[PDB]
Design a binder for these strands. Structure first.
Ligand SMILES: [Mg+2]
Ligand SMILES: [Mg+2]
Ligand SMILES: [Mg+2]
Ligand SMILES: [Mg+2]
Ligand SMILES: [Mg+2]
Ligand SMILES: [Mg+2]
Ligand SMILES: [Mg+2]
Ligand SMILES: [Mg+2]
Ligand SMILES: [Mg+2]
Ligand SMILES: [Mg+2]
Ligand SMILES: [Mg+2]
Ligand SMILES: [Mg+2]
Ligand SMILES: [Mg+2]
Ligand SMILES: [Mg+2]
Ligand SMILES: [Mg+2]
Ligand SMILES: [Mg+2]
Lengths: 49, 106, 49
RNA sequence: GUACCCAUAUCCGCAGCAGGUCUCCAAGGUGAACAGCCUCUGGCAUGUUGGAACAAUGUAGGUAAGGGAAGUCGGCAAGC
RNA sequence: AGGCGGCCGCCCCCUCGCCCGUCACGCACCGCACGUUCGUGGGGAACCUGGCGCUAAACCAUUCGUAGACGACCUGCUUCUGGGUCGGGGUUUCGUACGUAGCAGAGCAGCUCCCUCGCUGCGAUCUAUUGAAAGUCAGCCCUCGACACAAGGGUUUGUC
């Protein structure tokens, strides 16, 4: 889903500086990646094999 | 191979969403036949004139949202169909709909 | 989520952000409240009790 | 001479064709009204097909923040 | 874009595995071509025997929506942390349901213990019950609450 963030902006030389800025912010659920396989590649003169 | 009878609260308002005004009440009875075929298992479904009145009591486009039904299964004789069992869906009225669930009726 | 294959500063990357407020209002419609306890403390008792 | 149709199916148009053809009877409500809308007496199965989904384009209908004719040969169409 | 080659220790054996000399034969098919080759050539269907083993997967059907003109794409299916239908909550949308009571209510009409807001009847609305009622996933979330369902079918597919 998507949410807001009321974010303080530490970027000098702007009207944005030292003010609260609300931005469109997404959320991506990322479960931990379980490792299974190993794949190796040989560099060929047509690409990778 | 049983003669069982169960009650249900089919929700036509959430089984129909996006059907036009001149088809909203006829598609409800195809949905009731499909629900009876899914629940009891036989393709032969006979709904009653009381259930016809209960569906068509408020026009074609103002379909009543939820209907208490009673599905009975019976056998067939006298040069019967290849489907020996048929679901006779009958209508039973009830004032409220809250806290009502599926009841196996003797 | 792929790592960026080019490294740039541009005063656009590696800025220490300061998170202040992240809204969790009702996205199923128009949101009116932040948390369940705040909604109950604003509305008070109902027919549920 | 005396049946029957007298018509979006008995007439004419090559046809059960959104075409054309002369008449009498006409109720209740709202309403000035034989206007428009809903009913009764009386008819009908939606007009030579049904089932599933609601893609583009189309044919009819309705909207849209701010500007209000700046588009276009022309306020054409639509709307007040 | 790999499969033959090299070393070590044995094995059934061979000292004619090759050039020089002697001997005698094997088709000498009597003039004739496509003959001798890397071939135990490439792949396809079967026949009988030895050993080692293998015991499935797609497509339809059904469901699903993250997809769809039709095809196509991503998905679920077990009897226990499986799915489905109702129900229950959470969220939301509109705005306070029917009934009840009122010494609220513009007022009006009737009755008599002649009534120190007297009662009754009609009466747009209003108040309390009432942030009430109603819908809420069909393309929202959780539910181990109640029911039934579950290995149930059809078509096809092998590499000397
Ligand atoms: Mg006559
Ligand atoms: Mg005609
Ligand atoms: Mg005409
Ligand atoms: Mg003609
Ligand atoms: Mg009249
Ligand atoms: Mg009048
Ligand atoms: Mg028809
Ligand atoms: Mg016709
Ligand atoms: Mg506008
Ligand atoms: Mg506007
Ligand atoms: Mg103006
Ligand atoms: Mg001008
Ligand atoms: Mg001009
Ligand atoms: Mg005009
Ligand atoms: Mg307008
Ligand atoms: Mg109402």
């Amino acid at each position: 889903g998507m949410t807001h963030i009321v974010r303080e902006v530490d970027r000098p030389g702007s009207k944005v500086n030292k003010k609260e800025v609300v931005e469109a912010v997404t959320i991506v659920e990322t479960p931990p990646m379980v490792v299974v396989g190993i794949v190796g590649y040989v560099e060929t003169p047509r690409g990778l094999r | 191979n049983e003669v069982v009878t169960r009650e249900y609260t089919i929700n036509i308002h959430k089984r129909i969403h996006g059907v036009g005004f001149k088809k909203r009440a006829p598609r409800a009875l195809k949905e009731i036949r499909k629900f009876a075929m899914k629940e009891m298992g036989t393709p032969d479904v006979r709904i009653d004139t009381r259930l016809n009145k209960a569906v068509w009591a408020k026009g074609i486009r103002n379909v009543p949202y939820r209907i208490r039904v009673r599905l009975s299964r019976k056998r067939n004789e006298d040069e019967d169909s290849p489907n020996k069992l048929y679901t006779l869906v009958t209508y039973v009225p009830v004032t409220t709909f809250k806290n009502l669930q599926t009841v196996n009726v003797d | 989520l792929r790592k960026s294959l080019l490294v740039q500063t541009k005063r656009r990357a590696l800025e220490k952000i300061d998170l202040k407020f992240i809204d969790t209002t009702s996205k199923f419609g128009h949101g009116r409240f932040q948390t369940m306890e705040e909604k109950k403390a604003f509305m008070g008792p109902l027919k549920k009790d």
